[PDB]
Symmetry: C2
Subunit: 277 residues, 2 copies
């Protein structure tokens, strides 16, 4: 089955959300707001550039889908937890960090050499966006060598806090997995809690890394007696991690197969050379 | 017919060069040198991170090539003149800006879905490196929406000043195309001069953009009577540009077909929102 149109319309959903955020944020914040938050004119300028780039990413997907005889998805209805400039930068970082696995997963389904070149070229742009927002928020712009994929439903899981409703059947999220803390080095013990009362029998932690793939462990129990399941960041991983609860070892490569996913994933910002110290 | 090994060994040549540069740069410069140049500890830390990431990109290509039964290319012999931090940053930006079209071109030849996912994941990392070095040198980290490909020999042309010799038959560069100026906005008139004498019969300027593909124009002549050919940055382009001389108009998509290339390409840093003000 040629899944090209499916993949493109999924990416269009991703870019409708991102473009809506940046259009609204540029509308509501000025360079003076950025400067009051300690940023420079060129940071606001690049922020407008990100808006323009994401509008292009959305419009290009619309054009390509139409050229293939498809019907482009409309926007959904969104909500963004924006108050001050700092929150704008955090939301931006969150969106761009989820962009990359979305594009990487979708590229597995794009049949054409030429269309892969175009889509990869947009992934490259969103990776530059991610590096910019990392740097502005004190995170390493390039924390590791390899970014990895996630599935469409995994991406829906990352996006769900920003979606109020969709007017068409979009990819369904898994329940949200809350991580505490959501950043830190190898060896960090992460308390994990699920938004729904899922079956925890046989649950394992999947730590999804770009450089090592999926690494499995059986969860621990929180030392504070709260009953939360813990997952410990294992050695050898590099870059941004995604942590999920999965059914046993049913799946070796969770980034390309969500058939065992129970809760999550959510992102974890692994410490890296380049973080503010 | 399956060009996967050819593409991977070409990328290995690219990453032998980049990793060699960053290894020697870290040996020669310290965090105190970076701080004396106005940078912060986190910028030196990220620089070491880039070295580590590029070493990983190289080593991963070696492993994959062996796993496919191929013989990995050894390093070439390089020349990287060592002066100051400003030069380190400029060379770094130059390498990362060239390694993105290298990966995008090579990805056209990689047959396996799973190998494409891995290689795209490294391209994403190099795009983050490029964004970091752009920002530290006062250029927009994300100057446009789409990065485009170049051919193997185009990449060899960009790399040629760093290569002393190779101990195996490597892709032969085209002559260098010098561009004056090498940055500016739409409408900039660029004086173009080739390193070798070329028959000018039917030569066109090829402006190679990621968002609009290759745009062709007949060269102009410098107004100062200097007799140098000129190419004018056309409307609508976004992001980093590559400018080459090509012969005739039978090849339209120069980023994927170098069979009409005569001189260049060389890079041109198009002005963008995010450049230092
Ligand atoms: Zn995008
Ligand atoms: Zn994005
Ligand atoms: Zn690399
Ligand atoms: Zn690189």
């Amino acid at each position: 089955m040629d899944m090209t149109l499916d993949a493109l319309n999924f990416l269009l959903g991703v870019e409708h959300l991102a473009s809506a955020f940046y259009v609204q944020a540029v509308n509501n914040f000025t360079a003076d707001d950025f400067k009051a938050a300690g940023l420079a004119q060129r940071d606001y300028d690049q922020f407008v550039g990100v808006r323009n780039n994401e509008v292009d990413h959305r419009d290009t997907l619309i054009s390509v889908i139409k050229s293939l005889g498809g019907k482009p998805n409309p926007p959904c209805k969104y909500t963004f937890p924006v108050t001050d400039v700092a929150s704008v930068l955090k939301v931006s970082r969150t969106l761009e960090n989820a962009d990359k696995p979305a594009y990487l997963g979708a590229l597995r389904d794009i049949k054409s050499v030429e269309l892969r070149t175009s889509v990869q070229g947009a992934l490259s742009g969103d990776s530059a966006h991610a590096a910019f927002f990392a740097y502005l928020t004190g995170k390493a712009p390039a924390p590791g060598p390899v970014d990895g994929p996630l599935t469409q439903r995994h991406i829906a899981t990352l996006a769900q806090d920003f979606i109020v409703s969709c007017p068409y059947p979009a990819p369904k999220p898994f329940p949200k997995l809350t991580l505490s803390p959501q950043s830190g080095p190898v060896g960090t013990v992460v308390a994990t809690t699920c938004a729904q009362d899922v079956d925890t029998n046989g649950v394992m932690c999947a730590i999804i890394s770009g450089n090592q793939g999926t690494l499995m462990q059986r969860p621990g129990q929180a030392k504070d007696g709260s009953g939360a399941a813990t997952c410990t960041i294992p050695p050898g991983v590099k870059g941004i991690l995604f942590i999920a609860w999965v059914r046993g070892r049913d799946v070796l490569n969770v980034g390309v197969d969500d058939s065992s996913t129970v809760c999550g994933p959510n992102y974890f910002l692994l410490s890296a050379l380049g973080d503010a110290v």
